[PDB]
Symmetry: none
Subunit: 206 residues, 4 copies
Amino acid sequence: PSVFLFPPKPKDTLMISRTPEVTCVVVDVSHEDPEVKFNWYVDGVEVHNAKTKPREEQYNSTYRVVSVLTVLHQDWLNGKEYKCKVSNKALPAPIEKTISKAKGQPREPQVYTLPPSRREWRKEEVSLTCLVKGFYPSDIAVEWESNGQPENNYKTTPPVLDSDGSFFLYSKLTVEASRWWQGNVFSCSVMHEALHNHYTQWSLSR
Amino acid sequence: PSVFLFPPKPKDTLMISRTPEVTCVVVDVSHEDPEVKFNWYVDGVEVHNAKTKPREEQYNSTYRVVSVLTVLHQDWLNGKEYKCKVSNKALPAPIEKTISKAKGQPREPQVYTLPPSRREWRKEEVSLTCLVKGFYPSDIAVEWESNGQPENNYKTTPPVLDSDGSFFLYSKLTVEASRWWQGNVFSCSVMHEALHNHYTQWSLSR
Amino acid sequence: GGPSVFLFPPKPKDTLMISRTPEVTCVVVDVSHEDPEVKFNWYVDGVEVHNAKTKPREEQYNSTYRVVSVLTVLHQDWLNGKEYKCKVSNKALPAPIEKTISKAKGQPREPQVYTLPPSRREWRKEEVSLTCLVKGFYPSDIAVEWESNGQPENNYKTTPPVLDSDGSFFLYSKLTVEASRWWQGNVFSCSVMHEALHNHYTQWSLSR
Amino acid sequence: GGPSVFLFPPKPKDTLMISRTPEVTCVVVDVSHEDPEVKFNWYVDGVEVHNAKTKPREEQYNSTYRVVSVLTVLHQDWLNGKEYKCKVSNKALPAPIEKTISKAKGQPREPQVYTLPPSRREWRKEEVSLTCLVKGFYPSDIAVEWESNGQPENNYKTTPPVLDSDGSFFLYSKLTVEASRWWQGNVFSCSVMHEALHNHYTQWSLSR
């Protein structure tokens, strides 16, 4: 079989109501020896403490077993390393795969909101756009909200390498011309590692 | 025979980058019989993880044993209850003081930016006021920043109860008239459990 | 050792008005069900007076009593930094407890009173709020009321005094009116009262 | 035995413009040292084609070879969605590997190009960022360039096109300008190239 390790999603590591989760999937375990054993090393330390939890089954005449390891918000941010040992009988000698924060030199993203072009003002649907430039690591959380409730019709591009050894992106919230001109205000919310408070909100009004 | 239980500081619970802590102390108890045995329980279930401290002798002739358990932001946010236990033969009565998050319906605050009064104009230092009202519980963190850097001449007030069982407070950002008249933006940051993603940020300039 | 004596200054609005008569209050909590008689002695700067109207006791659900004595003081004496002593004597007391309250000593600084209109996003709300900011006073003793065309308002609480980096305080006070009431253009008036004011009083209006 | 094969389409500006010549490029990676012969059968919609250009071998930092092939398409032929199939024949491979690239079958949409001046909180910044929003197009074959006054501004990056709720596409460009260039009146243009255009080109200018 083959092993893949995945980082916590980037809104899990900075919010207080979520639990960050490194998940370890195995993909090609046969119908012959489909038993799996997940041994988690945190920086050489062995962790059944943080409850790992395999709970999954197969497809494609194979077996896809994933293992989720709860982590602490701080430890993921403080460079701690997380290993995963998988002990299946088809494979010769155990597979160990690693994952860590991002190494790197953190970079604070500048966040600017951009009112829609005047060529789409008197259409049916304006497009508010919010650009975050100059961040590192490549992992951010861009969402929109308006009047304390979420907004759900917005699409963020991928992060893009700059020549400044940092990343940018654009999120575009499409909202009806009705609400734009009602005076309603919509906000761009960025969660990043390197922000003070991990958080910033910038408003697009009038 | 006297112990006390103190809850985590509101700000330590609103920021992944801090650690909440519940504090059990002993005072006016340890006389000729020390060795207290703290037993911590998280919503009934047993927990070690706790780091009690050596004893401190005052001129009260007594001693002071303090035991600090670290709290997880989600448990607290979900009102989980934490327990304490007893010393030696000096106490026929077990001590089981227990503390939880403020119980009751949560209410998100409304946070408004207010500019200086016209009467303030031309004075060397001008004031910026943020009004935050309608929250519950009183767990809240206010912070003025400019350019993502936090200000140093802000002062927040105690949260006061309203008619509607709500809270409000104010935060005054004293700032030299130059930085204001120039056009620099200042902005206050409120972290509270009932906000969307538990953060908000309203900016202000003129 | 059990019976605890707490002393309280007069309410600010009673000291700052020449007509109202202020009242320092010496309360004793946690006196026994079995020694319920307690003696109140009041000293004014060292000379004991006899305007103490010691109240009747009150059995508290602690299975203890709470006993209160109130001494009637003067607009000039409390304001001139006088010191009022309350010597409390019960049989259960290892020491006849003496407590001493006085006006905070220092240079009176007159408070500057800014009125701050509803924020623009509150205009979309049903009830707008008018913000008074009393700033730059000492001592902390102060009183803030709101008025409308000469009639009080109802919905207003006031932020307790907050220390300032220059040994002064500030406070805030919000009054909540209907959106209707603000746009009809009524005048609302923040009445402040601090010792260092012309007749201890001042007032500022907010409209439009 | 391990050879891996890919098929990359001609570039958009390679297409759309009759002055440029578009080519489909098949690249074969991980070819053996002992077995270095790769054979490229080229087919265009099921007919054999010998237009097939160079087969120049290259060397990489392992026991691996990299052999690429280039086939010249006709702008009309690509823009008519012909399937381009290529067949590689290593001795390490028992059954040849094939791969087919073609255009995206669907109805084209014209791009909508919105030029946006930088936000206000960038105005005191050393540099200023001009951004170009290209909305609602199909397929995702579009080119986006910049030019301030005839010569081509070269300090820009573009996001990959990402899919909207319509099933249309949108992307962004970002010109980074030194603030003085912007503040004097220099006019910057976001030139765009797509298939569903007239003459396959527009350009909207922006200065302030």
